[PDB]
Design a protein around this ligand. Structure first.
Ligand SMILES: *[C@@H]1O[C@H](CO)[C@@H](O)[C@H](O)[C@H]1NC(C)=O
Lengths: 48, 48
């Protein structure tokens, strides 16, 4: 997410034994890095 | 060629050369005003 010129990333690495879909349950996400990018962001793509 | 010379040149640097001709190491620390959230900042001291 982007807020106040701040780029925020929250992450979680829970072990999942269901390969079909995300399992029913709850696991909160802890923040990792809050780097002050300040570049307005409107698009996103993923690498492999 | 006629009225033609290499724009680049090298000056012989010697320890016994004049002080004016002696090379000095020069660093310029260009700054800029606070138009955005600051990232590089001076250390902030903390009391006991
Ligand atoms: C948001 O993006 C716009 C262009 O769509 C830009 O003018 C503006 O400065 C941006 N805001 C920030 C905080 O980067």
């Amino acid at each position: 997410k982007n807020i106040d010129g701040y780029f925020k990333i929250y992450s979680k690495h829970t072990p999942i034994n269901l390969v079909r879909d995300l399992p029913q349950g709850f696991s909160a996400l802890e923040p990792l890095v809050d780097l002050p990018i300040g570049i307005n962001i409107t698009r996103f793509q993923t690498l492999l | 060629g006629f009225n033609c010379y290499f724009p680049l040149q090298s000056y012989g640097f010697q320890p016994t050369n004049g002080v004016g001709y002696q090379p000095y190491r020069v660093v310029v620390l260009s700054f800029e005003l606070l138009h955005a959230p600051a990232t590089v900042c001076g250390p902030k001291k903390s009391t006991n």
